[PDB]
Structure 1
Amino acid sequence: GGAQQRELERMAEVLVTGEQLRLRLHEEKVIKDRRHHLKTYPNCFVAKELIDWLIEHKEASDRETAIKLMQKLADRGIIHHVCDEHKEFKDVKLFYRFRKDDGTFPLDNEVKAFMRGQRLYEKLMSPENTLLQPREEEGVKYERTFMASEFLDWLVQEGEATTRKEAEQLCHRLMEHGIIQHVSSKHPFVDSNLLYQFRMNFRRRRRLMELCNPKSVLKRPVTSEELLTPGAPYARKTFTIVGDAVGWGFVVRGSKPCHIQAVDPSGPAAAAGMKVCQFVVSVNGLNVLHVDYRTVNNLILTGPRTIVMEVMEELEC
């Protein structure tokens, strides 16, 4: 895959295996807290004992191979020596610990980019981000194809990078590493339909030896024109409602006709008729046949305590 793959991907792969190795070892209890002569040492694993485990599991054939792999790991810094700072693997029962157990944990731009990419790939693998699908661009169908436009949208929507500009710049770094490459020409990340193919795959890790708001009530969609026409079953009525100690108890939520939304059954409005399925056109004299519900709300409140209201009062039709 060229220099870009051969360097960065190889670094990525050893870390993926080291994490795979650590998880297995923790399950196998190789790394466990130890106390030497009443002095503690947490998350420690003796170097000499580990070689035996590898041979049983077939990761390392013999002492030579195990030492070489561990030496390669040390040259990276994924592990360190708790007892001494030589940090060179030896076939002696000496406690060691991974940089990932927070003994040192140095983090490089490559590591941070790789780890975020791994976490994003788990999201892509997960149903949460299902954009990965077989799709065809430039006449060829490739697996794990997700439109670059869709990806940029998904990043903002998901919130991994809320700002699109920030997201776009980050993708270029991943493209440089080779984590994501456009399916055909590896065209740099743009807000375009360009489908991409994830060169990096999370699974099949390397082997050691290889290293809502509204509701609405009235059925009628619009009654404004029918109300305006004289001939309709509706007979107009005027209701004068007196205020109460705690309020009138009615709500009007009609956009154009300002129909009554709800009425408190124990409130004064319900006592003086004022059924839910009604329409109003004038309040305290002023005609409000064509205004917004909000505008209506402000006017009624500022008026007197007693309100003169005209109700359309459809006759069961």
Structure 2
Amino acid sequence: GGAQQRELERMAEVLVTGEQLRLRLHEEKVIKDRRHHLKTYPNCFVAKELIDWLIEHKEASDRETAIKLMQKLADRGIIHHVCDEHKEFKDVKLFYRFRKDDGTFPLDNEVKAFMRGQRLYEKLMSPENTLLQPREEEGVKYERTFMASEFLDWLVQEGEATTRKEAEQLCHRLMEHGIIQHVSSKHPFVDSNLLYQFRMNFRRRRRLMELCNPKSVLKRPVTSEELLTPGAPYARKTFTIVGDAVGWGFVVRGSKPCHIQAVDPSGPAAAAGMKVCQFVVSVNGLNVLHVDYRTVNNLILTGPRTIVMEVMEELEC
């Protein structure tokens, strides 16, 4: 796959295997806190004993192979001696700790891109991001195909990169690393239909030896011009409501007709009729047949304590 695959992926692969190894070792209890004659050492694993563990699991055939594999990890920095570093791995009862255990944790730009890509792949594997599907572009069907335009939308929606420009730039870095490659010609990431394939897959790691807010209660959809026509469905009525210490207790939430949204059953309005299924066209004399509900809400508050209101009062139709 060229220099890009041979270098970056190999670095990625050893890190993925090292992480797989660390999780396995913790389950096997190889890495455990130790105290040497009242001198503690947390999250430690003895170098000499580890070789035996590797032989049992068949990762390393003999002492040579185990040392070589661990030396490769040391040349990367995935592990470090708890005390002053001994550099090349040695078959001695000595305490070592992983970099990812925060002992040193040397970060780099490649690692951050790799780690983010790995985390994204877990999201892509999960149902949460189901963009991965078999799809055909340029006459060829490939698995794990997700449109580049769809991916950019998903990043903003998911919140991994809220800014589209930042999201698109991040993919270019991954494309340079090779984490994501366009299916056919490795075309650089663009907000287009361009189908992409994930070259790096976290699963099946390598082996050591191989290294609705609003509410609407009005049934009538629209009454504009339905009311204006004289007679027929409704009979007009005028309601005069007196102010109260606790307020009138009614809400109007009709865009054009300004229908009454709700009425307080214990309030003065409910005592003087004022049922929920009503429409208003004039308040305190002024005709408000065609205005917004909020504008009417401004007028009723700015008006006097006693409000003159006209209710359409549909007759059960």
Band of TM-score, shorter chain: over 0.9
Q: What's the offset of the Cα at 1:85?
A: 2.1
- Alpha-carbon deviations, 1:101-125, whole Å to 9, x = none? 1111101111111001100110011
Matches within 5 A, 1:41-80: 41-80=41-80
Structure 2: distance between partners of 1:108 and 1:224: 65
Return the offset for 1:287.
0.7
Contact kept? 1:149, 1:192, Cα under 8 Å: yes
- 1:253–1:261 CA contact under 8 A, matched in 2: yes
Alignment of 1:116-127 (within 5 A): 116-127=116-127
Which deviations, in whole Å up to 9, do the C-alpha atoms of 1:225-282 show, x marking residues without a partner? Answer: 1111113131101011111111011111111111111000000000001111111111
RMSD of Structure 2 on Structure 1 (CA) = 0.8
Deviations 1:126-185 (A, max 9, x none): 111110000010011100000000011111111111111111111111101111000000
Pairwise CA distance, 1:283: 0.8
- Does structure 2 conserve the Cα–Cα contact (< 8 Å) formed by 1:250 and 1:263? yes
**Which deviations, in whole Å up to 9, do the C-alpha atoms of 1:36-92 show, x marking residues without a partner?**
011100011110000000001100000111111111111111111113322321111
Note if contact 1:226-1:232 (Cα within 8 Å) is conserved in structure 2. no
Identity of aligned residues (%): 100
Of the structure 1 ranges 81-90 and 122-131, higher mean CA displacement relative to structure 2 is found in 81-90
Task: Give the TM-score normalised by structure 2.
Answer: 0.99
Shift of 1:217: 1.3
Unaligned 5+ runs, structure 2:
none
1:197-220 per-position Cα deviation (integer Å, ceiling 9, x unaligned): 000001010100001112211211
Question: Quick check: 1:258–1:279 contact (8 Å CA) kept in 2?
Answer: yes
- What is the total number of aligned residue pairs between the two structures? 317
- What pairs with 1:204-243 in structure 2 (closer than 5 Å)? 204-243=204-243
Cα distance in 2 for partners of 1:233, 1:171 equals 62
Report the TM-score, using the length of structure 1 for normalisation. Answer: 0.99
| Residues 81 and 88, structure 1, Cα contact 8 Å, conserved in 2 | no
Q: Give the alignment of 1:1-317 within 5 angstroms.
A: 1-317=1-317
